[PDB]
Write a protein that binds this ligand. Structure first.
Ligand SMILES: O=C1CCN(c2ccc3cc[nH]c3c2)C(=O)N1
Ligand SMILES: [Zn+2]
Length: 108
């Protein structure tokens, strides 16, 4: 393999994204934010991610990224919750905000 830095689903090993695809939303790819119950999520933003399935309809409620609606993104292979897909925005129109602790960075 290439050894290129990629992110795998911690639960099943599926390749989900690459360090090359980190996206600095608002100036940083990492956003330490909270779900509505006060649990911290260290979210890493990516311009592209693979192997995900979206569930439900997009919502604007509690959106961490002003102007974007979110949808839950699961691993399409094992069903584990890996983060959210954001859409309806300006630049970029869509992106992924993934939970860093749900992924494992490693060599491709
Ligand atoms: O931008 C977003 C992403 C989704 N999100 C969220 C919403 C509800 C729940 C309930 C448990 N974890 C949640 C996370 C949020 O607050 N903002
Ligand atoms: Zn998985």
């Amino acid at each position: 393999g290439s050894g290129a830095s990629i992110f795998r689903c911690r639960q099943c090993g599926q390749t989900i994204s690459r360090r090359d695809w980190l996206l600095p939303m608002g100036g940083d790819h990492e956003h330490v934010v909270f779900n509505p119950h006060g649990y911290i999520h260290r979210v890493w933003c990516f311009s592209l991610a693979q192997g995900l399935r979206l569930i439900g309809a997009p919502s604007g409620e509690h959106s961490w990224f002003k102007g974007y609606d979110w949808t839950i993104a699961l691993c399409g292979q094992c069903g584990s919750h890996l983060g959210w897909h954001f859409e309806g925005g300006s630049q970029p129109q869509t992106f992924f905000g993934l939970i860093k602790d749900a992924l494992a960075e490693g060599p491709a």
